[PDB]
Amino acid sequence: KLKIGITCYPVGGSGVVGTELGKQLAERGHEIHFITSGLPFYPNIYFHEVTVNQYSVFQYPPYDLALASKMAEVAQRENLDILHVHYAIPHAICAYLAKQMIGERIKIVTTLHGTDITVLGSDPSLNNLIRFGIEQSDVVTAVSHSLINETHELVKPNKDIQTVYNFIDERVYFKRDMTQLKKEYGISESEKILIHISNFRKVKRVQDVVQAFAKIVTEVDAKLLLVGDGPEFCTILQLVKNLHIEDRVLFLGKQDNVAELLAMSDLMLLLSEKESFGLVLLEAMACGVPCIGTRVGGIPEVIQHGDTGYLCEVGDTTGVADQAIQLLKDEELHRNMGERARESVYEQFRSEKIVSQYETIYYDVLRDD
Amino acid sequence: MKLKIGITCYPSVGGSGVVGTELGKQLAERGHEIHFITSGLPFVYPNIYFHEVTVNQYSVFQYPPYDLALASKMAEVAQRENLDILHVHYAIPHAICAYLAKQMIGERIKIVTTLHGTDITVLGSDPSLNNLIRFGIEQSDVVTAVSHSLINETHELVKPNKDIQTVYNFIDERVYFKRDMTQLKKEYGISESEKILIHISNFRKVKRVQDVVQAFAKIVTEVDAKLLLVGDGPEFCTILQLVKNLHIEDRVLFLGKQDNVAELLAMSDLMLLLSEKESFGLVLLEAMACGVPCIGTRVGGIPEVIQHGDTGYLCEVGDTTGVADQAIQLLKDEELHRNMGERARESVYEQFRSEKIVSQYETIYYDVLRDD
Numbered sequence: 001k002l003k004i005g006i007t008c009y010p011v012g013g014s015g016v017v018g019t020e021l022g023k024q025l026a027e028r029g030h031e032i033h034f035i036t037s038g039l040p041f042y043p044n045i046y047f048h049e050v051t052v053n054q055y056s057v058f059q060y061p062p063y064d065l066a067l068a069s070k071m072a073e074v075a076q077r078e079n080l081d082i083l084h085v086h087y088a089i090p091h092a093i094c095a096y097l098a099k100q101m102i103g104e105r106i107k108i109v110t111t112l113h114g115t116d117i118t119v120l121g122s123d124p125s126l127n128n129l130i131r132f133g134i135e136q137s138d139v140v141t142a143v144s145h146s147l148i149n150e151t152h153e154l155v156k157p158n159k160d161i162q163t164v165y166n167f168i169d170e171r172v173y174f175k176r177d178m179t180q181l182k183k184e185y186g187i188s189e190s191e192k193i194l195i196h197i198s199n200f201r202k203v204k205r206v207q208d209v210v211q212a213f214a215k216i217v218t219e220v221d222a223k224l225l226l227v228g229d230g231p232e233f234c235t236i237l238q239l240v241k242n243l244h245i246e247d248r249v250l251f252l253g254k255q256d257n258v259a260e261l262l263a264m265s266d267l268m269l270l271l272s273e274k275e276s277f278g279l280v281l282l283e284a285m286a287c288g289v290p291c292i293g294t295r296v297g298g299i300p301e302v303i304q305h306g307d308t309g310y311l312c313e314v315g316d317t318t319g320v321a322d323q324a325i326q327l328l329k330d331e332e333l334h335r336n337m338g339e340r341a342r343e344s345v346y347e348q349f350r351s352e353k354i355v356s357q358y359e360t361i362y363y364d365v366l367r368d369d
Numbered sequence: 370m371k372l373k374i375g376i377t378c379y380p381s382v383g384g385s386g387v388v389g390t391e392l393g394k395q396l397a398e399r400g401h402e403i404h405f406i407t408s409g410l411p412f413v414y415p416n417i418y419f420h421e422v423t424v425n426q427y428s429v430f431q432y433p434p435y436d437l438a439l440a441s442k443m444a445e446v447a448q449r450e451n452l453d454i455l456h457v458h459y460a461i462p463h464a465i466c467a468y469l470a471k472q473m474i475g476e477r478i479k480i481v482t483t484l485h486g487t488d489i490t491v492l493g494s495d496p497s498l499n500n501l502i503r504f505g506i507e508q509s510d511v512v513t514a515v516s517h518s519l520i521n522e523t524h525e526l527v528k529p530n531k532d533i534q535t536v537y538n539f540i541d542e543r544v545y546f547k548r549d550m551t552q553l554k555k556e557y558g559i560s561e562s563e564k565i566l567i568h569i570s571n572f573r574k575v576k577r578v579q580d581v582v583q584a585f586a587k588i589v590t591e592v593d594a595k596l597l598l599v600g601d602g603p604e605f606c607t608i609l610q611l612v613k614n615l616h617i618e619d620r621v622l623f624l625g626k627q628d629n630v631a632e633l634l635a636m637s638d639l640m641l642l643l644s645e646k647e648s649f650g651l652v653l654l655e656a657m658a659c660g661v662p663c664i665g666t667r668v669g670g671i672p673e674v675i676q677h678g679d680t681g682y683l684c685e686v687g688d689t690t691g692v693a694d695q696a697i698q699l700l701k702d703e704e705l706h707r708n709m710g711e712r713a714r715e716s717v718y719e720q721f722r723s724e725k726i727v728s729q730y731e732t733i734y735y736d737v738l739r740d741d
């Protein structure tokens with residue numbers, strides 16, 4: 001009964017997630033309208049270009065005003081009930097305009113993915129905008145509690161936001177037969193490998209990940225995978241170059257296929273100082289990989305110290321070292337944890353369970369009048 | 370009863386740019402508090418201050434969120450300072466940003482949109498942005514346009530529910546005056562004694578620069594002229610070619626981008642503007658301000674500035690011959706020219722006088738802070 005309009009990015013952290021939601025809302029019956037800037041991914045979905053080719057005195061390609069317009073068009077001709085948007089900064093203020101232009105004939109559901117706050121909401125040049133985007137939405141949701149917390153103190157909106165966690169594509173992440181092409185990486189020695197797929201910035205504290213591999217490899221014949229190329233590349237490329245080994249810590253480069261070399265992995269590391277939700281942590285667990293993450297932001301909402309993984313202080317290389325060498329020694333516990341970690345995913349991060357929350361929201365917002 | 374105003378405009382290179390910046394200065398010079406909230410620093414005084422909208426600190430952003438940044442700063446600046454008026458100039462990124470910023474600050478502020486040509490005549494026809502412009506306009510307290518011509522078009526394309534007022538552009542009178550350029554006239558090898566035709570203006574295809582040189586080929590057969598082309602862009606190359614095929618390479622000077630338009634005008638005899646669509650274009654008013662008589666095509670709001678009778682000459686678009694004849698006619702009769710030029714300078718200090726037009730925006734500002 002519900003005509004729904006999803007809007008997300010063709011960030012890979014904001015889109016794909018809002019996509020799978022639309023992908024699977026069409027399967028429950030709903031009419032789904034993808035209003036978006038890119039062409040990236042069904043009998044119940046239609047796309048909308050959102051052309052940006054309008055530039056003369058084009059210093060600034062008017063993408064926002066063009067976006068807020070396509071929303072107004074698609075919602076006035078196809079007559080939408082809801083306008084769901086992801087990532088607050090670009091497409092929430094955009095959504096407010098369309099509603100305003102089409103005469104309050106629509107309800108809005110904003111969904112705060114982490115990055116739109118912990119990175120942007122730090123400079124006040126734009127802070128009062130996020131606030132107004134949020135406050136003005138009909139319903140607001142966040143993919144974490146640590147994210148709901150940051151918002152209420154960084155931005156301090158007069159609105160109140162509920163939690164809906166991010167599901168992963170449980171159809172792309174699973175235990176894989178990853179020993180055959182695994183050998184082509186020179187890595188079939190019964191090595192016991194460790195992976196790290198961060199973003200690449202200095203906030204992700206990779207200087208530790210390498211620093212810890214050094215301290216742990218002295219007691220385990222282990223190999224490292226540094227997935228993700230960015231600003232810190234040069235610095236880390238040295239940290240191994242001079243610190244003892246590059247024979248066992250090859251930077252795999254930024255790969256589009258992380259999932260495959262995840263199943264291959266035996267334990268991932270994430271020692272960032274600041275993260276709202278870890279999408280790759282699920283992506284790790286979802287295919288049976290135990291992991292060590294730092295007690296930081298929204299990490300203890302994905303990791304339960306215990307059977308799923310471990311939580312260690314932000315910045316403790318010698319301390320992180322332990323929990324790795326300890327686990328790589330034992331065989332049973334390592335396999336035990338690798339399965340319960342896989343399980344906790346499909347227990348509280350179920351693709352159908354999360355979509356279920358969204359749908360109940362969609363209906364509950366439309367309901368009073 | 371003085372006033373705190375918030376003026377916004379583009380860096381430079383268009384009508385909107387200089388027209389805001391000047392009205393900022395003029396108003397400051399009258400005791401009003403003039404906060405500039407812009408993309409950067411437009412072309413140091415004692416009375417306004419500037420609020421650059423830093424577009425920096427952004428990652429994994431599809432594009433530099435200027436629009437949203439402008440709105441954020443606009444609304445922030447209107448509070449810290451408590452502006453009584455937000456005066457937005459070229460409409461397209463600004464009138465939405467302003468409206469947006471008004472809504473952010475409890476609607477304490479009053480908003481004024483000032484439609485200059487381009488945002489209506491081309492963006493208005495764009496189905497992606499049309500709907501928005503309409504909303505941008507309607508949602509503003511007072512909307513003014515640079516000519517009556519621009520108002521009609523705004524009603525034909527954008528079709529807003531708002532009445533829009535008329536307030537022409539203006540010009541710092543102190544900047545343009547007959548001057549003599551004996552030194553610069555030599556560096557360009559224009560030492561043959563007289564007859565410099567000027568066309569300072571845009572490069573876009575709508576500017577009909579084609580016709581500007583075509584007519585100049587038909588002109589140059591007879592008076593020993595030199596065309597001074599100023600500004601570069603899309604058609605720039607295309608035009609650079611056309612002159613070649615005409616053998617007039619050694620008479621046409623492609624000055625391209627220029628900052629001191631005052632100097633170049635002060636050595637010019639006859640300005641041409643042959644736009645197929647134009648909405649005013651000061652370049653006419655800037656010329657007339659120093660004596661230089663203009664020949665423009667009869668479109669848009671050109672008839673509002675050039676009085677066909679005495680201050681210049683209007684001829685239908687594409688009539689390259691038509692311009693040329695009127696051009697040679699005028700340049701030949703040395704008595705008629707000096708009288709025409711002197712009358713053009715009159716019309717400017719009378720109809721488009723700076724103290725006047727400024728006083729109009731000022732008296733607009735006041736009449737929208739009463740009854741609220």
Ligand SMILES: O=c1ccn([C@@H]2O[C@H](COP(=O)(O)OP(=O)(O)O)[C@@H](O)[C@H]2O)c(=O)[nH]1
Nearest residue numbers: 382383384570571599600626627630650651
């Ligand atoms: O090379 C140039 C091009 C333009 N301008 C200035 O830009 C303004 C308007 O030019 P444009 O055609 O770009 O805008 P429009 O006249 O259409 O409003 C004039 O006042 C000029 O003083 C200039 O100084 N040098």
